[PDB]
């Protein structure tokens, strides 16, 4: 029955190029209209193109018009999406789907997609900055202190406190994949502001990929 399979997605750098492919089975590709819809990690679905069965018409989203070009081979039941002049923002998962034939043109069957990453991210180490409040949140019974493990690559990062001693109140958040292909994550340990100026709070960030280990002692 109906089945769509992407491929070609991979990891490339800005400006570079890449050509995705979508091969279908279970139906006559030549009888339908095809589209590519992409989705950046954790974001909505964004429409890219539509291509008429006889290929006489090709429609592209402003964001990609000029750099991306759709093509097909109804004989080889294949759709193709050649992307050139890559941008970071083009990074997302590329889905090719069969465009339905009723109502305006929504698709009906989507392939699982092929992931397209695009960065120059090499192997930076994390910078570690102290996370403490100004004067308002400092005047509580139990404020929070933490370490900002900014701009690193690639995952994962290990955070701890007082070389493993402190465990309660600790909350190491999941890393955020900033635009510049580099990860960042925070780690806060909630503690009483009473015995705050007597005890020591030191996170121990570990980033083997970079062979880095940092120890920042945060003070109130």
């Amino acid at each position: 029955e109906v089945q769509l399979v992407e491929s070609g997605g991979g990891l490339v750098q800005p400006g570079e190029s890449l050509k995705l492919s979508c091969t279908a089975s279970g139906f006559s590709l030549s009888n339908y209209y095809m589209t590519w819809v992409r989705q950046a990690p954790g974001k909505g679905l964004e429409w890219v193109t539509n291509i008429r069965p006889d290929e006489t018409e090709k429609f592209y989203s402003d964001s990609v018009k000029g750099r991306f070009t759709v093509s097909r081979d109804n004989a080889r039941n294949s759709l193709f999406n050649s992307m050139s002049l890559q941008r970071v923002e083009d990074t997302a998962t590329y889905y090719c789907a069969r465009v339905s034939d009723f109502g305006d043109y929504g698709p009906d069957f989507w392939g699982q997609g092929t992931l397209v990453s695009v960065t120059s991210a090499s192997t930076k180490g994390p910078s570690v900055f102290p996370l403490a409040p100004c004067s308002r949140s400092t005047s509580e019974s139990t404020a929070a202190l933490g370490c900002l493990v900014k701009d690193y690559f690639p995952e994962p990062v290990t955070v701890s406190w007082n070389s493993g001693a402190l465990t309660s109140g600790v909350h190491t958040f999941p890393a955020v994949l900033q635009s510049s292909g580099l990860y960042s994550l925070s780690s806060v340990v909630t503690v009483p502001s009473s015995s705050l100026g007597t005890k020591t709070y030191t996170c121990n960030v570990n980033h083997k990929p970079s062979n880095t280990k940092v120890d920042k002692k945060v003070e109130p």
Binding site: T35, V37, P41, G42, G44, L45, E46, W47, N50, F59, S61, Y95, A97, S100, F102, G103, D104, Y105, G106, P107, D108, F109, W110, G111, Q112, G113, S127, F129, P130, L131, A132, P133, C134, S135, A144, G146, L148, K150, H171, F173, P174, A175, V176, L177, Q178, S179, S184, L185, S186, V188
Partner: protein, 209 residues
């Protein structure tokens, strides 16, 4: 440009009905579709031409529309109905669209998010960079919305929010980061991170001091 204004999140109890909307200026002239996308899975068609319904989509998924608002009504909510739903249609001269999407959650005791806001460390500032960190903890169901404010004015340039994460206590964790330049951080007089979850809105603020 144009928008399929779609509520970011929606939650319902196992067995009850759920209703997702999708506003739009041209919806009265164009059809509306609905797709279901389960985490890390290709989207799936559930509604077409406003009310059509595929022969694999259970009858409880009822598409409808009128004027400038299409509505995907899912009755007898199931645990499997937990996923992202997007509406589709197009502009006033054929170019296809997609709504922001909506998150559909099910059941466990509902909880409000623990928001904490941090200003840029004087240290990172010395590095000619500023970064406001907004940690969102212990919320349920796992769906939140993060908007940043520059002195009560909104801003989008420089925001990177994470995808709700499951903590060990079966509640969710989220983090949002607003990157400024040492100059902007001092430019304004207050930056605020507002995390709205289930109609509820927690808004912590910080200012250069």
């Amino acid at each position: 440009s144009y928008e399929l204004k779609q509520p970011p999140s929606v939650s319902v109890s196992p067995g009850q009905t759920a209703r997702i909307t999708c506003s739009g200026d041209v919806l009265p002239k164009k059809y509306a579709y609905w797709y279901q996308e389960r985490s890390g899975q290709a989207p799936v068609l559930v509604v077409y031409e406003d009310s059509g319904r595929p022969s694999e989509i259970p009858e409880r998924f009822s598409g409808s529309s009128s004027g400038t608002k299409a509505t995907l009504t899912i009755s007898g909510a199931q645990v499997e109905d937990e996923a992202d739903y997007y509406c589709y249609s197009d502009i006033s001269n054929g170019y296809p669209l997609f709504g922001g999407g909506t998150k559909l959650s099910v059941g466990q005791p509902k909880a409000a998010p623990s928001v904490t806001l941090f200003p840029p460390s004087s240290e990172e500032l010395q590095a000619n960079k500023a970064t406001l960190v907004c940690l969102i903890s212990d919320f349920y169901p796992g769906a939140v919305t993060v908007a940043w404010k520059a002195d009560s004015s909104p801003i989008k340039a420089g925001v990177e929010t994470t995808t709700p994460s499951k903590q060990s206590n079966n509640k969710y964790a989220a983090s949002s980061y607003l990157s400024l330049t040492p100059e902007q951080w001092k430019s304004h007089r207050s930056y605020s991170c507002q995390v709205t979850h289930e109609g509820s809105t927690v808004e912590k603020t910080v200012a250069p001091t």
